[PDB]
């Protein structure tokens, strides 16, 4: 991993030692080249996972998440340029450094071999995330959004820290490979049931689980666009990735311990998807859509089947690209009229025909049109849950209906109908903006062509 | 003060703790604590206003009372065993009043009420001495008798200090009072681990000191006594915004900053001794500290509060501060977690 | 070696430098009373340093290259605007007065620093001790709010007691009907708009407050215009003053050391003029505040500390 | 009121530079930022990254496993052995509890 991490660290001096007129062109270009180098992790010609050293590894679960992380950094930079163009030069460089910091921290997080190392990097990400939300968010509610985000995470993370220390005191190590091979059955004591919850809650809050999700709609509505991109695409996946790594040592208590969280997720995914039908704020709508999708990820990880893990891995990647695309699409209208109210701008297909095409594909991805990886992940999750209990299809069926309703509702409301023609400041789409949309959507199509790369650990 | 007075008084402030740390005899340790009390009073009251007089008086009566209780324990032990050091055979009540009186000297809760008031009434550079240099002598005594101390009293003092340091700091708009509550919370962590691993007490003391010293220097740069005063930093000395933010997050124990290390290691050691419930309670309520530090970070570097017209005249003036000790401590208090194995053993 | 405790211990001491004319003298009076011509000649005849009256640009001219700055960098206040519309709802009247108090405070610290470090006396034209006569006149004419008065008295309470007052206060008494005639002959378009009621308030504040207050601790010398017109007569009165009252009598080497430590540190001098009291007249929002501050650091010689600005010819930066 | 700037006015980015690409107000900086994104993002990463992934051989030993399966199916059938047995481990290698 050092041949990926070291060049990423060199982006920081590159940012600060570049001329003001070359900073964006420089950092974006090398960020693309670093994404290219991360593809080396996909050269996997056997079934032994790559252990580069005692500290860094990569297997079929972390490899897609590392590459998606590397790809997001250039995309976030392009997304940020227009709304930062009034900041002075030092403030622009500070913002870029925050974005690089997350890229470095997240790549290290997904390749860490030891759980307290994962925990430290997992917690470190809050610092640049909070700074981005609160220093560059637009509204007065960005400060409250920062508090919710930081402290929903932290209250769950403290029990996680206790559990990790406890496991290490008992086993002698937090190395993941050794924990895997030497794992032994747990007794079903009250003490072990609290251990299960301490190991799971921080990851479940991060997903977020329905019930403790209020931080996420707040954080998205208030964050700048690059903050929304990283939060929806990668940061939520830390919880799902954490749950998959740590659940190997929690057997057999997950068989009964999972029931309340399957119930919250399967019912909760209907509550949050139905909220999207009556949401007046476009960013909030996309955010609630994420909570509904991540509810599926929670359910499939909880039932721990080969299909359920594979469907969760695909959905994690597919949602990452799709939701980041939707935030970028919404931000392009906001940068023109400076409102997130969905019903304000209307008939936009009349004036932005190619941007409306990007809107349609993002919406078709979101409602899981086959053969997209969006549908493939949701399909295999549905099959595994049906096996777990045939009555799950009732709640799946309701969510599928509602997801089509709000996905097409967003398109009809904003792109169709009569143009709101008092909006004479609807400047034509930027080349940068149209390029940004394509950089989301080409990988989604390419991954649909070769879905072996995101199947995860079980297939 | 003229130079002769400064030299004598500062020398006595330095001398007392050195006597306490080097003494075999418990009476000479008490003498060292006596030098500290006597020498620091004229510095506390140097500026001579009603608030500084109140602060010096409250400090004197608390410290002198605690000193008498410590002396009682020393004398009772001399009566019991004919020696001038505490032993394994020292009566447990004698050791419990030593712990009580030293914790009152340190300002641990529930003997804490004086400390936020005295810190508020004195100059910032004296608050710095009060919360750093003056902790060393009473802690040094405790570390010597760590196998003799009662774990029950310690943990109750420790959890109480963390709880009241947290809730105490939540209501403050005065910087000197926020630092005092930050002191009490960190002393709660130092004390909790003392009977188990006194080396980790010293690790926490060192990291607390190198966090607190540059935080006081940052307040001293413009004499920022309140949240609203420190919120003008963006206009007066914006270059400090990065390091104040990281020092505040380090004081709150957020990873990957150096201040995460003391909380992390103490939890590890407490749970090696099955002190799981206290460690959980301690770590959970320490998050409340991060809340009021974050609110402080919100008003300094992450938003820009309204400024005033006279501040433009300040921008015309050159400053000669901070000294380069600020940068050294600021960097080592925030960016040294990668060197954690070299700090614990 | 910058002045400090070490330099003080190594001989650098104020009382060795004080001589007969190591005095602080201020010249007061109404507008157009002849203070400047008198202050210049008192200083010249006594071998003292003349400080022209601190104006809006005083800080601008004693820092940087000494050239005046754009007004948004210099208090964003206008004397001409004050006379055109003393009741403007943009807060110009009190913003001006607050800025002028702080500029006077800076000058008083600069003059005291000069006297304490050299032993040469200084001659001032009004001072922080007499700045309030203008504030009272504004308030009595309804030009500023009462809250502006309370704000001003708080800043004065926090700053003025730290300093030593002048040795001698010289007052020129010109009646208001004569002051008005001199302003009209002076020929300034905006100053000609000053009401006589405003000038009377200044005189009332001077004669009921400032002079009785100053006589408790300073030598006070009052002159009419005809006496002041011959500055050699005023000097002769100064040469034979006794200076047997006030705080300067109980100063010693170490009280002078600590006053010198205050007055060489200008941000310490100006500290309490910037307390966060959110009077609208003198409160700047962050958008304006940060735009102004960013532009100031783009002026020549202002991006870095003095001696580190390569674009104004500073050299050896890599070894400084 | 306090002293605060008025809100800035809406600006049309294309009014001064009708060839604006979205990257910078300076036209030359703008076009080169556009070219770098298109060259490194699309010409390099998306084309060569796609090519490199396409030619990763035997990804996760899927080609070897089918090749190995055919070898075993062939072997297990000529010799009359079962294609796949219920017991992964030979029972002779296992010692069950007496009870």
């Amino acid at each position: 991993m050092l041949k990926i991490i070291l060049p990423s660290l060199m982006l920081l001096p590159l940012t600060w030692l570049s001329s003001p007129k070359k900073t964006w062109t420089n950092v974006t270009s090398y960020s693309f080249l670093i994404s290219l180098t991360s593809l080396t992790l996909l050269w996997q010609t056997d079934e032994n996972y790559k252990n580069f050293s005692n500290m860094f590894s990569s297997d079929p679960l972390s490899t897609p998440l590392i590459i998606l992380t590397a790809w997001l950094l250039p995309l976030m930079l392009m997304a940020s340029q227009n709304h930062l163009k009034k900041d002075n030069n030092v403030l622009q460089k500070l913002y870029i450094s925050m974005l690089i910091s997350l890229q470095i921290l997240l790549i290290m997080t997904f390749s860490a071999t030891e759980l307290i190392m994962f925990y430290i990097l997992f917690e470190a990400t809050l610092i640049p995330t909070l700074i981005i939300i609160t220093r560059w968010g637009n509204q007065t509610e960005r400060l409250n959004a920062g508090i919710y985000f930081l402290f929903y995470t932290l209250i769950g993370s403290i029990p996680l820290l206790i559990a990790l220390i406890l496991i290490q005191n008992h086993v002698g190590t937090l190395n993941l490979m050794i924990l895997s091979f030497t794992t032994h059955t747990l007794d079903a004591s009250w003490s072990n049931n609290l251990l299960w919850l301490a190991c799971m809650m921080a990851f479940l809050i991060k997903m977020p689980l329905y019930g403790v999700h209020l931080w996420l709609p707040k954080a998205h509505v208030e964050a700048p666009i690059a903050g929304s991109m990283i939060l929806a695409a990668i940061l939520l996946k830390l919880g799902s990735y954490g749950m998959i790594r740590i659940s190997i040592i929690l057997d057999p208590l997950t068989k009964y311990m999972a029931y309340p969280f399957i119930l919250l997720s399967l019912w909760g995914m209907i509550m949050t998807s139905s909220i999207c039908l009556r949401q007046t704020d476009l960013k909030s709508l996309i955010a609630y859509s994420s909570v509904s999708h991540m509810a599926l990820v929670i359910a499939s990880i909880m039932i721990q089947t080969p299909w359920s893990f594979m469907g969760a891995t695909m959905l994690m990647i597919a949602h990452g690209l799709t939701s980041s695309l939707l935030f970028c699409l919404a931000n392009s209208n906001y940068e023109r009229i400076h409102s997130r109210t969905m019903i304000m701008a209307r008939g936009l297909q009349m004036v932005f025909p190619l941007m409306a095409t990007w809107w349609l594909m993002a919406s078709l991805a979101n409602l899981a049109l086959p053969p997209s990886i969006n549908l493939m992940g949701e399909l295999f999750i549905t099959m595994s849950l049906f096996s777990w209990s045939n009555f799950t299809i009732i709640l799946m069926g309701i969510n599928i209906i509602i997801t089509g309703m709000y996905s097409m509702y967003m398109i009809i409301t904003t792109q169709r109908g009569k143009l709101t023609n008092h909006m004479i400041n609807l400047q034509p789409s930027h080349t940068r903006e149209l390029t940004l949309m394509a950089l989301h959507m080409i990988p989604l199509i390419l991954l649909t062509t070769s879905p072996k790369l995101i199947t995860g650990l079980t297939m | 003060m003229n130079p002769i007075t400064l030299a004598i008084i500062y020398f006595t402030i330095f001398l007392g703790p050195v006597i306490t740390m080097s003494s075999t005899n418990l009476m000479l340790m008490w003498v060292g604590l006596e030098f500290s009390l006597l020498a620091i009073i004229p510095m506390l009251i140097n500026k001579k206003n009603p608030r500084s007089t109140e602060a010096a008086t409250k400090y004197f009566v608390t410290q002198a009372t605690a000193s008498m209780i410590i002396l009682l324990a020393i004398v009772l032990n001399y009566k019991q065993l004919g020696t001038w050091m505490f032993q394994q055979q020292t009566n447990g009540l004698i050791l419990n009043m030593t712990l009580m009186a030293l914790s009152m000297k340190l300002g641990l809760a529930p003997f804490h009420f004086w400390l936020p008031e005295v810190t508020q009434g004195i100059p910032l550079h004296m608050g710095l001495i009060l919360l750093t240099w003056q902790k060393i002598a009473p802690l040094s005594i405790l570390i010597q008798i760590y196998p003799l101390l009662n774990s029950t009293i310690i943990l109750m003092l420790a959890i109480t200090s963390i709880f009241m340091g947290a809730w105490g700091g939540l209501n403050q708009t005065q910087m000197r009072k926020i630092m005092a509550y930050s002191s009490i919370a960190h002393m709660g962590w130092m004390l909790a681990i003392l009977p188990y691993n006194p080396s980790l007490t010293l690790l926490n003391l060192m990291i607390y000191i190198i966090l607190t010293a540059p935080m006081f220097m940052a307040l001293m740069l413009n004499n920022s006594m309140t949240i609203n005063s420190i919120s003008l930093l963006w206009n007066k000395t914006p270059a400090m915004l990065t390091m104040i933010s990281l020092m505040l997050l380090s004081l709150g124990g957020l990873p990957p900053l150096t201040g995460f290390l003391p909380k992390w290691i103490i939890i590890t050691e407490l749970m090696k001794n099955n002190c799981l419930i206290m460690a959980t309670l301690m770590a959970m309520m320490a998050l409340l500290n991060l809340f009021f530090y974050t609110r402080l970070i919100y008003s300094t570097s992450l938003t820009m509060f309204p400024t005033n017209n006279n501040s433009k005249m300040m921008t015309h003036q050159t400053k000669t501060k901070p000294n380069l000790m600020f940068s050294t401590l600021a960097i080592m208090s925030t960016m040294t977690l990668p060197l954690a194995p070299q700090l614990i053993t | 070696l910058r002045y400090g405790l070490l330099a003080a211990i190594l001989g650098d001491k104020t009382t060795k430098k004080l001589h007969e004319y190591s005095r602080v003298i201020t010249v007061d009076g109404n507008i157009c009373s002849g203070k400047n011509k008198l202050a210049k000649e008192i200083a010249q005849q006594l071998g003292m340093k003349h400080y022209p009256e601190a104006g809006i640009q005083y800080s601008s001219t004693t820092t940087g290259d000494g050239r005046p700055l754009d007004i948004e960098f210099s208090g964003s206040c206008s004397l001409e605007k004050f006379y055109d519309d003393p009741k403007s709802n943009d807060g110009n009247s009190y913003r001006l007065q607050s800025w002028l108090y702080a500029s006077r405070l800076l000058q008083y610290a600069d003059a005291l620093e000069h006297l304490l470090s050299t032993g040469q006396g200084v001659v001032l034209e009004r001072s922080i001790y007499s700045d309030f006569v203008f504030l009272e006149a504004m308030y009595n004419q309804g030009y500023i709010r009462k809250q502006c008065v309370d704000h001003y008295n708080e800043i004065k309470r926090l700053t003025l007691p730290e300093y030593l007052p002048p040795h001698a206060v010289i007052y020129i008494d010109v009646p208001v009907p004569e002051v008005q005639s001199r302003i009209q002959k002076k020929g300034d378009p905006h100053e000609m708009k000053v009401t006589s009621a405003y000038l009377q308030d200044i005189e009332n504040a001077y004669k009921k407050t400032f002079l009785p207050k100053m006589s408790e601790m300073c030598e006070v010398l009052v002159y009419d215009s005809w006496e002041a017109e011959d500055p050699t007569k005023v000097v002769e009165d100064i040469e034979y003053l006794k200076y047997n009252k006030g705080p300067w009598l109980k100063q010693d080497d170490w009280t002078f050391h600590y006053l010198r430590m205050l007055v060489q540190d200008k941000t310490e001098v100006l500290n309490y003029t910037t307390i966060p009291v959110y009077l609208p007249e003198i409160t700047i929002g962050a958008h304006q505040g940060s735009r102004i501050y960013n532009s100031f650091r783009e002026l020549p010689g202002r991006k870095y500390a003095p001696g580190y600005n390569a674009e104004v010819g500073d050299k050896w930066i890599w070894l400084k | 009121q306090w002293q605060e700037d008025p809100e800035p006015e809406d600006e049309n980015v294309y009014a001064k530079n009708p060839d604006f690409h979205g990257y910078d107000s300076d036209p030359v900086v703008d076009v080169w930022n556009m070219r770098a994104v298109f060259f490194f993002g699309f010409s390099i990463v998306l084309v060569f990254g796609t090519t490199f992934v396409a030619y990763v051989p035997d990804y996760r030993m899927q080609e070897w496993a089918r090749r190995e399966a055919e070898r075993l199916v062939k072997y297990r059938e000529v010799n009359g052995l079962p294609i796949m047995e219920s017991n992964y481990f030979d029972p002779s290698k296992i010692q069950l509890p007496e009870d």
Binding site: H338 | Q172, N228, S231, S299, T303 | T283, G285 | W2
Partner: peptide, 19 residues
């Protein structure tokens, strides 16, 4: 619209003796 920054009413909630 411009980024919101604290106004007088926001800053005055820290001007009290306590929070």
């Amino acid at each position: 619209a411009r980024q919101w920054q604290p106004d007088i009413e926001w800053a005055e909630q820290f001007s009290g003796a306590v929070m």
